[PDB]
C-alpha cells in the first residue's frame, strides 16, 4: 500500500478533543493549528515542497475544518460541537444571523453523515482527498498531488467494499458530499471575510492570516 487507510485514521485520532460567531472564530483559529498537525500525520504530505504544502492548506483549510466539525456533530441534534467543547444550536445561529449557512451544514453534511454513519476512517479519507487538491493554483507538481489524490480514493473504495460490502454505492455516496462541502466552504469564507471587513468580531491571528 502506497496509502494505507490505517495511517489516515490515526491522523484523525491524533488531533482529537457570548456571540456564537465570536466562538466559531475562536474555534476556527484554534483548529487551524490542529489542522497543520493533522496534515503532517497524512502519508506523503510532509514530503511535498514547503510551497505546495502551504498552497494545499491555504486551498483546503476551510473545507477541512467544516468536514471535522460536521462529523463531530453526527450525535448532536440541530446543532454543532466546536473543538472548544461548546455546542452551538441552530437557534443561536439564526439569532446571530448565520442560520442559512448553519442549516446548510446540518442538512447537507451532519444529517447525511449521521444517516449513512460515515466512520472516522472515511472522514479521514475524504479530508485527505480535499487536501490533495490538484486544482490548487500555483502547485510545483500537480501530477504528484493528482497521483496522491488517486491513491487515497482507491484505498477508500477498497475500505468501503471490504468494511461495508452491504452498501456497494457507499463509495460514490461519500464522494458526492464533496460538492456540498465545496459550496458550504465558499459561503463560510464569504461570511468570514465579512466579519473581518466589518470588524464586528474579533479575528485571532492565524485565521486572520488565512483571510489575507
Amino acid at each position: 500500500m502506497d496509502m494505507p487507510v490505517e495511517r489516515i485514521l490515526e491522523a484523525e485520532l491524533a488531533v482529537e478533543p457570548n456571540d456564537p460567531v465570536t466562538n466559531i472564530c475562536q474555534a476556527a483559529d484554534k483548529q487551524l493549528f490542529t489542522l497543520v498537525e493533522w496534515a503532517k500525520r497524512i502519508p506523503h504530505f510532509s514530503e511535498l515542497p514547503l510551497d505546495d504544502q502551504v498552497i494545499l492548506l491555504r486551498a483546503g483549510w476551510n473545507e477541512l475544518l467544516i468536514a471535522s466539525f460536521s462529523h463531530r456533530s453526527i450525535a448532536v441534534k440541530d446543532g454543532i460541537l466546536l473543538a472548544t467543547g461548546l455546542h452551538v444550536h441552530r437557534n443561536s445561529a439564526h439569532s446571530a444571523g448565520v442560520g442559512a449557512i448553519f442549516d446548510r451544514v446540518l442538512t447537507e453534511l451532519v444529517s447525511k453523515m449521521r444517516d449513512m454513519q460515515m466512520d472516522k476512517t472515511e472522514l479521514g479519507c475524504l479530508r485527505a482527498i480535499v487536501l490533495f487538491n490538484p486544482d490548487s493554483k500555483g502547485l510545483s507538481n500537480p501530477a504528484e498531488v493528482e497521483a496522491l489524490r488517486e491513491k487515497v480514493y482507491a484505498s477508500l473504495e477498497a475500505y468501503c467494499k471490504h468494511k461495508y460490502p452491504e452498501q456497494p454505492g457507499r463509495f460514490a455516496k461519500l464522494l458526492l458530499r464533496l460538492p456540498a462541502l465545496r459550496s458550504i466552504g465558499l459561503k463560510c469564507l464569504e461570511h468570514l471575510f465579512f466579519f473581518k471587513l466589518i470588524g464586528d468580531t474579533p479575528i485571532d491571528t492565524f485565521l486572520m492570516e488565512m483571510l489575507e
Binding site: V36, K40, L50, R58, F206
Partner: peptide
C-alpha cells in the same frame, strides 16, 4: 509571506 502557516510546517513535531 504566510508567517504562521510557514513556522508550523517547518517544525519537526
Amino acid at each position: 509571506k504566510h508567517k504562521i502557516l510557514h513556522r508550523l510546517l517547518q517544525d519537526s513535531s
